[PDB]
Amino acid sequence: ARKALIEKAKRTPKFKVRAYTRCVRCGRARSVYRFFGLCRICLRELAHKGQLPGVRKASW
Amino acid sequence: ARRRRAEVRQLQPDLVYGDVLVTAFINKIMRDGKKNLAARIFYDACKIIQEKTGQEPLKVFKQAVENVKPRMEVRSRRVGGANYQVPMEVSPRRQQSLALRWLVQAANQRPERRAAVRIAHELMDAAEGKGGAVKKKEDVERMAEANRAYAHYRW
Amino acid sequence: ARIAGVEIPRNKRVDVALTYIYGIGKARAKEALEKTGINPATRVKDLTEAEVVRLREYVENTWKLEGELRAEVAANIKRLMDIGCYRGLRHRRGLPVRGQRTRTNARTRKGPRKTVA
Amino acid sequence: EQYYGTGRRKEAVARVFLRPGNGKVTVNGQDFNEYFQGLVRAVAALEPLRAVDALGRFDAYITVRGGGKSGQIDAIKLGIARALVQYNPDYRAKLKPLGFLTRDARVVERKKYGKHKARRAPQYSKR
Amino acid sequence: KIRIKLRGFDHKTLDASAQKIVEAARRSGAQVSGPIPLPTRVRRFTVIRGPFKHKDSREHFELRTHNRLVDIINPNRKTIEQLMTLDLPTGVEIEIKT
Amino acid sequence: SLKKGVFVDDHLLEKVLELNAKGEKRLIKTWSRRSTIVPEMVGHTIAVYNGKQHVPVYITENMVGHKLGEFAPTRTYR
Amino acid sequence: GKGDRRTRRGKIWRGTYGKYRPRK
RNA sequence: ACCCCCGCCGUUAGUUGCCAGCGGUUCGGCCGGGCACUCUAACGGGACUGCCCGCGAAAGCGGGAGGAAGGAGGGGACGACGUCUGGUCAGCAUGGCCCUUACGGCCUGGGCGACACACGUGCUACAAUGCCCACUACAAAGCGAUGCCACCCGGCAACGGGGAGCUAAUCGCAAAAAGGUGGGCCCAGUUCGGAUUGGGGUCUGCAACCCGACCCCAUGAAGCCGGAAUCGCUAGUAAUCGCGGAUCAGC
RNA sequence: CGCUCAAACAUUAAGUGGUGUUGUGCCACUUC
Ligand SMILES: [Zn+2]
């Protein structure tokens, strides 16, 4: 229930209730930023990677 | 503080009496930052002064804190394991921390309902001495007297 | 004066006096004073003879309270007990009935702590 | 004719319009003592006026905004000081020393992460 | 009589095109207000630094958005054309109304 | 808690509305512990599921505004 | 108190307004 | 140290603000009007033990003036060679290993929320520096187009209907709360404390029994400041008061 | 209030014992 799990969040054959956000890259269901479509873990990487437009290290 | 002596913190003078002792004790009645309460309480106390005694409020306030002002406290010194209570002098900037505080206690021990009248009537008995705040001074002073035995560790 | 048949609120705010009445609180106390137009300030020791009668005839006749109310509460529970439902099994054992905590807390309907371990 | 300075304090900034006259002190409308009803911290604002004896000779229409109530009075201090030092540069020799022309950068420091209140670590444990 | 909104993620490139706009416009017809530096939105998304049970020492970034405004009273037939063959942004956003 | 259209599942009403046609028995396998007891399903004995099995429980007149799940515990120890 | 479900000092904590808090 | 925020000033800008300046005013920054200031957000300036004196071999230290800011101005970003054979193969990657009408796939439902009990972390308090209620006032940084919902109506209310504007420094979440003023309560297990429970009720969502959030009546508990021990903070800190956001149909 | 006990708990990385304090009848030694 890892592989097949990802292909379940693209179908939505039943109620909209059973719909949830899924990490595009990895496949996590927890900590998925509705802005990126990524999970807290990797979007951090792709944030070290500068492959994320605009996204920059912040300090104040 | 192990590095520097840590210079004492200077607070701003009163806004009605212009004195660095008044506000020094105000923030002492102050709880959680509500500087207003303790201030109002304080003055409503000095209004009790001018009603009970024809004296001037700040006068009975200067003489009150002075009375509950510890001359010689008792502290603890370590001399090779053994742990005594070596008495000695009370730093001139401690007498002021304590005294202003030691009125706070007994005024919060009073049966009186309103807070103004607990610091008012208490400061009217501190300048007298018979107050139950000075009875927190007379006590610690006794602990030093009776301990004047182990005085040869006065450092 | 005995208002709830046997309950006697006296010597205090007439509005708050009705609070100690089983079935009356802080919302029904502001209602009976406005339907009989009575002073919510004056104490109970001093009011019209027709006012003790006024609130006694009204209040004790407006709805259910006192002991006949507690009476029904027990029954309502005794109905959750008889057939034996879930919102019944929670009275029947004494645990909380809102699916709350039981692994910790819940001492309100679990009594004092028992330890043993 | 006019005097002006610019004093700030914790987001709460304040302008200062000085004009020769009575002792009138209107701040964004609002009578002076009125806009600080029941606030002992008030009377501290008009401090740079008794250090110059020109309290009963100068009105002043203030325009403060931002921050809380008590912090504002601090943005009126820096302002009244800069206003009576502009049209009067000589009052500065005996003004700055007593302490009246300083920003005072004491600001609520950012809350840290791993804390509730920046300098507030979760009640430690070990059991 | 004409307004334009410049949104972007890099104020360096955004400010260069904001200034680029004034040169052509002004110096060919209409009175034109300089670059108006509008308030700055910032999307700060904080995240747990570690990949597991390490709720602390985390790391957070921000997605700054720079917004600048410029107006141009008269849309000169000489400027309308002066603002189509000289405009070469990149990762910038622009909008035009009336 | 719902108020308009007291919720339920149609299947169960399906297999029971035929029981009101010629009043036969009162037996049926169910899975909708969610649904609401019908004031018209009085006297039947439904078997409600709880993750473990089916519990045959009789319905009366007092219990109506409740659900089947109430009369079908899920915690082995009641 | 702040833990009250029927006071001004309560509704200012539970987010809700209800009867005991100004509204349209 | 080179970077960012906050402190002082100036340049560039005037759909943010301003009877400051005058004119009209439904006397509301609402119209004209203006860039001053406030602000907004970019560019730079500034502070280098530089100046004075004292101490000193130098480095450096102590004192004073100027100054918005001194001796690192407050705050962040930044964590070495390695250690913990620390953590995670369940985020992903990945050698080895086992399963393969199955250790894989589906679904409804249950469960992860079970309670004789124990620890960590928490919130609310046990009240007169307070509880309650009315009126009245002041933030920052943020977030919002089947989302934020102005205002009108019903309703005790949660809410619903009607409907304006808003992809937003233009509309909206928006009352900030404690504060201020007036009022009540008058030391009581209380108008403290709101745990628990009965009844009625609203909304999201196929569906709230197991298990949701919230409203009203009612019921109103342990609780009168906490043993051993133990916890945080050197200043706008602790404490104390609020507000929003990520996650989300809701919680 | 003092005195004896079997536990819950607290002191230590851990163990042990001790002890602290409630409950009950009236720092030492050690970690194969
Ligand atoms: Zn990922």
Domain span including residue D31:
1-127
Distance of CA E1 to the CA centre of its chain: 20
Place of tokens 């630094």: E49
Under 8 Å between Cβ of E14 and E92: yes
Alpha carbons within 13 A on the beta-carbon side of B113: 0
Q: How far is CA E31 from CA B56, E71, E85, in A?
A: 72, 9, 20
Alpha-carbon gap, residue B44 to B57, rounded angstroms: 10
Alpha-carbon gap, residue E76 to F66, rounded angstroms: 76
Under 8 Å between Cβ of A33 and A43: yes
Alpha-carbon gap, residue B104 to E4, rounded angstroms: 65
* Residue E1's CATH number: 3.30.70.600
Would you call B103 helix, strand, or coil by DSSP?
Answer: helix
Alpha-carbon gap, residue D80 to D68, rounded angstroms: 19
Question: What is the DSSP secondary structure assignment for residue D3, as one 8-state letter?
Answer: B
Beta strands (DSSP E) in chain F are: 45-49, 54-58
Alpha-carbon gap, residue C47 to C45, rounded angstroms: 7
Q: Among F1, F45, F70, F77, which would you mutate to test the C interface (most chain C Cβ atoms within 10 Å of its Cβ)?
A: F70
Name the structure determination technique.
X-ray
| B147 token code pair | 């301990």
Alpha-carbon gap, residue B144 to E32, rounded angstroms: 84
How many Å apart are D99 CA and H47 C1'?
21
Q: What are the phi and psi torsion angles at F70 (to 5°)?
A: -60, -40
Number of domains in chain E: 1
Place of tokens 């950012």: D110
Delineate the domains of chain F, giving CATH numbers in brackets.
1-78 (3.30.860.10)
Residue B87, beta-bridge partner list:
B74
Under 8 Å between Cβ of D20 and D59: yes
| B142 token code pair | 């006794």
Alpha-carbon gap, residue E82 to F4, rounded angstroms: 64
Number of domains in chain B: 1
| C-alpha of residue E59 to centroid of ligand 1, in Å | 16
How many Å apart are B91 CA and H82 C1'?
49
Domain span including residue B78:
1-155
Number of domains in chain D: 1
* Residue B49's CATH number: 1.10.455.10
| Strand I contacted by D127 CB (< 7 A) | yes
| E95 token code pair | 């909008």
Alpha-carbon gap, residue F38 to F43, rounded angstroms: 11
Under 8 Å between Cβ of D81 and D14: no
- CA torsion sign for B118, B123, B124, B130 is positive
List the one residue out of A48, C113, A11 whose CA is nearest residue E61.
A48
Of C79, C83, C93, the CB nearest to F71: C83
Q: What are the phi and psi torsion angles at E4 (to 5°)?
A: -140, 135
Q: What are the phi and psi torsion angles at E66 (to 5°)?
A: -95, 125
Alpha-carbon gap, residue F29 to F11, rounded angstroms: 11
Q: E20-23: long-range contacts (C-beta < 8 A, 24 or more apart)?
A: E20/E86, E21/E70, E21/E83, E22/E70
Would you call C41 helix, strand, or coil by DSSP?
Answer: coil
Under 8 Å between Cβ of E49 and E58: yes
Under 8 Å between Cβ of D68 and D12: yes
Delineate the domains of chain A, giving CATH numbers in brackets.
1-60 (4.10.830.10)
Torsion angle, alpha carbons of F8, F12, F13, F14, to 10: 140
* Residue D57's CATH number: 3.30.230.10
Alpha-carbon gap, residue D3 to D17, rounded angstroms: 6
Question: What is the DSSP secondary structure assignment for residue F58, as one 8-state letter?
Answer: E
Alpha-carbon gap, residue B116 to B40, rounded angstroms: 8
Alpha-carbon gap, residue F32 to F71, rounded angstroms: 12
Alpha-carbon gap, residue B29 to B108, rounded angstroms: 10
Alpha-carbon gap, residue E34 to D57, rounded angstroms: 44
Alpha-carbon gap, residue D78 to D14, rounded angstroms: 9
Place of tokens 């502001």: C30
Contacts of D41 in chain B (CB under 8 A): 15, 35-36
List the one residue out of E67, E63, E91 whose CA is nearest residue E18.
E67
Q: Label residue B19 left, alpha or beta by phi (over 0 means left) and psi (-120 to 50 means alpha).
A: beta
Alpha-carbon gap, residue D35 to E63, rounded angstroms: 41
| C32 token code pair | 């009976």
| C-alpha of residue B48 to centroid of ligand 1, in Å | 70
Amino acid at B20: V
Q: How far is CA D68 from CA D9, D61, D65, D71, G12, in A?
A: 10, 20, 9, 6, 20
Alpha-carbon gap, residue C36 to C54, rounded angstroms: 7
Taking the CA of residue B36 and the nearest CA in chain D, the distance in Å comes to 7
Q: How many secondary structure helices (H) and strands (E) does chain E include?
A: 2, 5
Query: What is the DSSP code string of D53-122?
Result: TTTSSB--EEEEESS-HHHHHHHHHHHHHHHHHHS-GGGGTTTTTTS-S-------PPPPTTSSSSS---
* Cβ distance of A56 and E91 shorter than 8 Å: no
